[PDB]
């Protein structure tokens, strides 16, 4: 090494200063930000009563931590169609807002639930924008949403003035004017009631059986995060040289403990040289003590 740092094959007597001596670290630990409250996804995914397709709910869900790994057992969905994000990486993404909606339709109009579609259900009942991102979840619900004699609990509009705007619900109740005769109301020739009722029955095969569909809408706007993922990885180390993936430190030390009487709402320590010497612990709230190799 002495020959290498002098670029010669002969070294006269004396004392030389070769390269630096440094202890390399080992292992690695990770943390997650200081969010703990979990998201109640069980209401949307499992509800005793569902409103009509025209009465679909536009609800807001936020201010929690979403666990997408637990919903796989909450419904027998198999499609799990996604457009703007991979289905596997929905946990480590932070989103400010989460959109949830649920309604009941007929099976023949389930594949039609997608951007760029038009027709019976994509123009009179449900429309989505072209730049949609997120995922689509659907499953069969024949055995708990159909009656052999007849189920009239779900109504769907089929006459409307035009194709309604996306992200909107039209709940107008009036008799469509489909003729020269003035359709004042009630019923009559050339005046048809648009609210035709479903007739879900076990006699129906694939296409007419009642199904259930849920879609989650996200947007990657530049707003502060509100709901994120969990995951723990390694617990803790006490006296070792380890790497960090903490809540804003990413240090590398032998952090053991801090016995100082630190102020409650203060996390990151500093010194006369502006060096971080303290870490807020996400779980025990115990301040650590940065110390190099």
């Amino acid at each position, epitope marked *: 090494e002495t020959k290498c740092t002098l670029k010669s094959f002969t070294v006269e007597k004396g004392i030389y200063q070769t390269s630096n001596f440094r202890v390399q670290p080992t292992e690695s630990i990770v943390r997650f930000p200081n969010i703990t409250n979990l998201c*109640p996804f*069980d*209401e949307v995914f*499992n*509800a*005793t*009563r569902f409103a009509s397709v025209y009465a679909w709910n536009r609800k807001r869900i936020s201010n929690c931590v979403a666990d997408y790994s637990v919903l796989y057992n909450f419904a027998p969905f198999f499609a799990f169609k996604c457009y703007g994000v991979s289905p596997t990486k929905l946990n480590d993404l932070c989103f400010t807002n989460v959109y949830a909606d649920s309604f009941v339709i007929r099976g023949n109009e389930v594949s039609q639930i997608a951007p760029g579609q038009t027709g019976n259900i994509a123009d009179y009942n449900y429309k989505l924008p072209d730049d949609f991102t997120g995922c689509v979840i659907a499953w069969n619900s024949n*055995k708990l949403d159909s*009656k052999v004699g007849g189920n009239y609990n779900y109504l769907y509009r089929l006459f409307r003035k035009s194709n309604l705007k996306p992200f909107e619900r039209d709940i107008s109740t009036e008799i469509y004017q489909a003729g020269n005769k003035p359709c004042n109301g009630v019923a009559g020739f050339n005046c048809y009631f648009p609210l035709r009722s479903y007739g879900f029955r076990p006699t129906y095969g694939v296409g007419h059986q009642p199904y259930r569909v849920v879609v989650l809408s996200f947007e990657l706007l530049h707003a502060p995060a509100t709901v994120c993922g969990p995951k723990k990885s390694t617990n803790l180390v006490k006296n070792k040289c380890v790497n960090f993936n903490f809540n804003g430190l990413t240090g590398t030390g032998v952090l053991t403990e801090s016995n100082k009487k630190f102020l409650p709402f203060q996390q990151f320590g500093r010194d006369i040289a502006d060096t971080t010497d303290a870490v807020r612990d996400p779980q025990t709230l115990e301040i650590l003590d940065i110390t190099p190799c």
Partner: antibody
Framework: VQLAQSGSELRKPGASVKVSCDTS????????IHWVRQAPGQGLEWMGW????????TYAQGFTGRFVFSLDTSARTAYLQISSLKADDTAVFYC?????????????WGQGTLVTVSS | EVVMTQSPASLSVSPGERATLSCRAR????????LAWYQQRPGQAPRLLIYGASTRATGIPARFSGSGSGTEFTLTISSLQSEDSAVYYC?????????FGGGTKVEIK
């Protein structure tokens, strides 16, 4: 309201107990009949139900494996079977039936059956 | 799941006085008045008294009257008699882990 069930029975520990529920006394607009288990000195604990006219049982978290749900050929009466009886498993079993379709309140209830696991 | 909470655990008041039984369920988004009230006399099976928000089943006396919406529910019975000495349970049929409350034992002095 006052549906008929089986009478009080005494069974040795580890054996099987037969429990029935008469339901054909009225007309019910429901495809489900439920069973309720009550602790001797504690609160109620929902156990499960079996799909009437379909024969598909529905078990709870702690009421599966040893608890058996079954129906009859005529699909009118409901039966309850419990095996591997333990000393602390003694309880009073009740039979309940809802009133309206898609309405899950137990409007009609059985008379009740009491079993004892002792010597 | 939902672990349904009922307080107080037991009540024993003089007959003829309304007794409020707090029946609060751990529902984050609410239950939408999907509550049912059952009274269980020792021996025979529990009997349903109130289904829904406040309306009672057919044949149920008007004394048993309940209310509530979403998370907070309260049942009030007017003019308690000796035949009302039983245990009252409330159930929320919102999702499908069908479970009942802890049970409040009502005693007649």
């Amino acid at each position: 309201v006052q549906l008929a069930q089986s009478g009080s029975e005494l069974r040795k520990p580890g054996a099987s107990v037969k429990v029935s529920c008469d339901t054909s006394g009225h007309s019910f607009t429901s495809n489900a009949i439920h069973w309720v288990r009550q602790a001797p000195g504690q609160g109620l604990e929902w156990m499960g139900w079996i799909n009437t006219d379909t024969g598909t049982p529905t078990y709870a978290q702690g009421f599966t494996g040893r608890f058996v749900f079954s129906l009859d050929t005529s699909a009118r009466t409901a039966y309850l079977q419990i095996s591997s009886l333990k000393a602390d498993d003694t309880a009073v079993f009740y039979c309940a039936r809802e009133r309206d379709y898609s309405d899950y309140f137990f409007d009609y209830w059985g008379q009740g059956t009491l079993v004892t696991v002792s010597s | 799941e939902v672990v349904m909470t009922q307080s107080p655990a037991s009540l024993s008041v003089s007959p003829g006085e309304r007794a409020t039984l707090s029946c609060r369920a751990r529902a984050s988004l609410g239950i939408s008045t999907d509550l049912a009230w059952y009274q269980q006399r020792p021996g025979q099976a529990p009997r349903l008294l109130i289904y829904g928000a406040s309306t009672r089943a057919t044949g149920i006396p008007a004394r048993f009257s309940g209310s509530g919406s979403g998370t907070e529910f309260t049942l009030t019975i007017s003019s308690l008699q000796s035949e009302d000495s039983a245990v009252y349970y409330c159930q929320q049929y919102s999702n499908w882990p069908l479970t009942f409350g802890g049970g409040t034992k009502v005693e007649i002095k």
